[PDB]
């Protein structure tokens, strides 16, 4: 899992931190609505499974048949691509804001399609650690983020960051994971490997200079996640 040499920058684009920029994120995906347009983004957790956020969807039981995933690309409008439909959905437990997704057929990996390492159960991310966040102009835009404690961010978030969450410190640039970018992953590099520690969820105020950003904590619900696939 969770290894790119690919984007020659993995530990070299920690220079262009102050700002949001274009770049590569292979594990990030793009959930495609019944009509055709992109509506939310995902995270390749296995060849069959796409972990993403509950808010992307209205109801956990709406017919999916038609809803599709688009792994392979950068752009959101060329056979450097894949197009796998969604067969079903599995609504994570009350408060996870999580949604796994079985695909009509297991995907094939390469340079710009790759799995990401799920973390240990309940493993907490140290402040200071470096994580990244892709998003959608017409192209992907990775951006590198500093991790901060639930102590630190509950100050600015006015004591409202529950135990099953995390925050990154605010980019000084007016840029951050907001509308249509939810469900996209929040990969963190540890022991020489990128590891899915969060999921872009709605924030109160988003892409706001010097303001934190909250994500739902994945390690907090992985025992659920494995159980969902294993069987």
């Amino acid at each position: 899992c969770g290894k790119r040499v690919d984007r020659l920058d993995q530990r070299r684009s920690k220079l262009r931190v102050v700002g949001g920029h274009p770049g590569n994120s292979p594990w990030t995906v793009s959930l495609r609505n019944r009509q055709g347009q992109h509506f939310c983004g995902g995270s390749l957790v296995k060849e069959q499974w796409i972990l993403t956020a509950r808010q992307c969807f209205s109801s956990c039981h709406m017919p999916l048949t038609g809803y599709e995933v688009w792994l392979g690309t950068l752009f959101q409008n060329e056979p450097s691509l894949q197009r796998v439909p969604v067969a079903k959905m599995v609504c994570g437990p009350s408060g996870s804001q999580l949604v796994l997704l079985k695909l009509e057929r297991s995907v094939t990996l390469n340079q710009r399609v790759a799995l990401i390492c799920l973390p240990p159960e309940w493993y907490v991310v140290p402040p200071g650690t470096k994580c990244e966040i892709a998003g959608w102009d017409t192209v992907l835009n990775v951006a590198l983020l500093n991790v901060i404690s639930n102590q630190e961010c509950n100050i600015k978030h006015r004591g409202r960051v529950r135990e099953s969450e995390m925050c990154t410190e605010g980019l000084l640039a007016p840029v951050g994971a907001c509308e249509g970018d939810y469900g996209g992953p929040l990969a963190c590099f540890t022991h020489n490997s990128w590891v899915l520690e969060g999921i872009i969820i709605p924030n109160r105020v988003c892409a706001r200079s010097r303001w934190p950003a909250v994500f739902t904590r994945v390690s907090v619900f992985v025992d659920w996640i494995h159980k969902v696939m294993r069987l």
Binding site: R54, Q55, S58, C60, P202, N203
Partner: protein
């Protein structure tokens, strides 16, 4: 012998109290109140085309124009941006709801396709300003066959706002007809995330809408809605069937999860309160006479003495519902009766089960025909087998077993319709703060009362005698009631103590009222703190039985304040000269002795505490002759 004094003749509810208020400008259309962190607070009071922000003393600090549409004044309309913004007309305020998490206040009226409006709250030292509005209607996402941002119906709507995760969810119910559902519809039921960029409401969401055929007859009112436990609940008033008479209303309770944005669990329960007057009137089917139309309701936690009744535990939430008769009957006008929450659920759970399991009572009804398609349990709407790809429990349903109760007040309320309720929990006891149509406030304990109501207060709100508005709100220890073009602030512990006309009732008052007896009147300490005392109280002699004896004689003294909670041990009686104590009203027997048309005096001294208050003193009656 012995007469009887009616438990009134102590209450005098004709005494008027002035109690601070706030002139509107016109008839009040809604209100809602803030109680922020830094002990900050406001009171927001709407009218036709204006919005009134009030301080914590009903003083209008900021007012703001909410209409008319198509007219260069109303800020809300102008904040929608470069026009046109129409059609033109008056903006009547159907929603006034605040989102505690931002914080922010909402306001949605019957102009402008029912769009809402946000008002980031701007603090002050125990005061709050509303920073300029921000139109909740995205240009490029909305359309006449799909307007996600259409929250407000002109036909009355309710909204409960809920925090899930890190964004705010809007559970939403609206009445609809042809002229509403036709196009740019608000849609009966829906759950909607508010977009973090204030531009409005995320599109998509599944929502429910009374189907095209039944837009005309089957109109649903939405009387009240709330959040408690892990559920948004929605309180209704609608026809009992799709094919039965459209004039056959009946209240239901519709539920949805408070953590799970989907209508897949749209449960609906039929509430059903009735009057039970011993005799049982003519056209009624035993049990009681049905009051099937709810006129207001309020959920709240209950006291010790009420939990016991109702068979529940102190603290538990209990919906309360103020039911009136079908149409306008002829009996009492209003019946209030408690539904506890847990038990509304536990019915609906066993409501669910019986509809979805191995053996299924063949000939049940998932129902709600008016919303979705008919279909027999367990299989979903229209379809005739339950294909295992989907479930049963992930479809909307109507729990057939209704929920039945009996008025908490055995019809004592009486003839003047109750219009507004706010139940609180003043210390260990509990109290209902009723408002009437004849323009009056009824603060009355909420114990299942058999023969009379335990009055705290009954008095007229101001002078213009007008019905008290349904939606009643609260600040610290001060409820807000509304009637006509005015808003009144009633203290939770009832304004005065000057209706209790007797040291009797007066010192039986439930502590919090502050009631003490100041000699020849009752009242708080303020009103006479030279002689205000809350402990002792003197016996009142009313009459006696043998009114002229010979020079033995079994006198029976008849009065009040004779007993402890009989008494005996020690009380003097001087019926012209010695007698002798020998073992509503409180009677007694006194064998007397010779002398060696006089009065008849009784005197209690060195007497132990009563539960509420202590008996000591003398009262003297005339009219007892001597015979030889």
């Amino acid at each position: 012998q012995c007469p009887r004094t009616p438990y009134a003749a102590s209450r005098d509810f004709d005494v008027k109290y002035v109690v601070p208020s706030f002139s509107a400008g016109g008839l009040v259309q809604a209100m809602v109140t803030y109680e922020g962190d830094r002990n900050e607070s406001a009171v927001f009071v709407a009218i036709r085309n204006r919005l009134h922000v009030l301080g914590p003393d009903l003083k209008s600090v900021q007012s703001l124009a909410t209409g008319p549409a198509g007219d260069p004044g109303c800020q809300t309309c102008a904040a929608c941006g470069p026009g046109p913004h129409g059609p033109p007309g008056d903006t009547d305020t159907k929603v006034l709801v605040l989102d505690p998490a931002l914080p922010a206040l909402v306001s949605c009226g019957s102009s402008l396709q029912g769009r809402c409006f946000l008002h980031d709250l701007e603090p002050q030292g125990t005061a709050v300003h509303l920073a300029a509005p921000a139109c909740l209607f995205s240009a490029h996402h909305n359309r006449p066959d799909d307007c996600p941002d259409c929250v407000a119906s002109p036909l009355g709507t309710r909204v409960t706002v809920v925090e899930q995760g890190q964004a705010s969810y809007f559970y939403v119910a609206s009445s609809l007809d042809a002229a509403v559902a036709g196009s740019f519809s608000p849609r009966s039921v829906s759950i909607r995330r508010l977009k973090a960029d204030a531009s409005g409401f995320a599109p998509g969401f599944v929502a429910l809408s009374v189907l095209p055929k039944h837009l005309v007859s089957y109109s649903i009112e939405y009387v009240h809605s709330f959040h408690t436990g892990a559920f948004v609940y929605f309180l209704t008033v609608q026809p009992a069937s799709v094919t039965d008479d459209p004039s056959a209303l009946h209240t239901r309770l519709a539920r949805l999860s408070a953590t799970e944005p989907e209508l897949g669990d749209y449960r609906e329960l039929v509430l059903d309160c009735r009057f039970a007057p011993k005799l049982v009137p003519r056209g009624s089917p035993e049990g009681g006479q049905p009051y099937p139309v709810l006129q207001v309701a309020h959920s709240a936690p209950v006291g010790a003495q009420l939990a016991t009744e109702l068979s529940i535990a102190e603290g538990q939430e209990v919906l309360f519902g103020v039911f009136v008769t079908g149409k306008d009957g002829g009996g009492p006008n209003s019946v209030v009766c408690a539904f506890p929450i847990d038990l509304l659920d536990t019915l609906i759970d066993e409501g669910v089960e019986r509809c979805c399991e191995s053996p299924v009572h063949p000939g049940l009804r998932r129902g709600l025909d008016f919303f979705q398609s008919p279909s027999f349990c367990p299989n979903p709407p229209g379809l005739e087998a339950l294909s295992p790809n989907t479930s049963c429990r992930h479809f909307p349903l109507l729990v057939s077993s209704s929920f039945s109760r009996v008025d908490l007040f055995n019809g004592l309320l009486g003839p003047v319709q109750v219009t507004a309720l706010y139940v609180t929990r003043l210390d260990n006891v509990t109290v209902a703060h009723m408002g009437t149509m004849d323009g009056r406030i009824l603060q009355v304990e909420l114990v299942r009362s058999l023969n009379y109501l335990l009055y705290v207060s009954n008095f007229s709100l101001g002078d213009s005698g007008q019905p008290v508005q349904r939606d009643v709100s609260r600040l610290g220890d001060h409820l807000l009631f509304a009637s006509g073009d005015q808003v009144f602030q009633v203290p939770i512990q009832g304004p005065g103590c000057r209706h209790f006309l007797t040291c009797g009732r007066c010192l039986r008052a439930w502590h919090f009222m502050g009631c003490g007896w100041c000699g020849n009147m009752c009242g708080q300490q303020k009103e006479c703190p030279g002689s205000w005392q809350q402990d002792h109280c003197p016996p009142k002699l009313t009459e006696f039985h043998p009114h002229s004896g010979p020079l033995s004689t079994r006198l029976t003294l008849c009065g009040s304040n004779f007993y402890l909670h009989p008494e005996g041990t020690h009380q003097v009686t001087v019926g012209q000269s010695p007698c002798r104590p020998l073992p509503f009203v409180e009677e007694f027997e006194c064998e007397l002795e010779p002398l060696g048309p006089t009065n008849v005096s009784l005197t209690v001294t060195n007497m132990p505490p009563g539960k509420h208050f202590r008996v000591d003193g003398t009262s003297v009656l005339r009219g007892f002759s001597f015979m030889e």
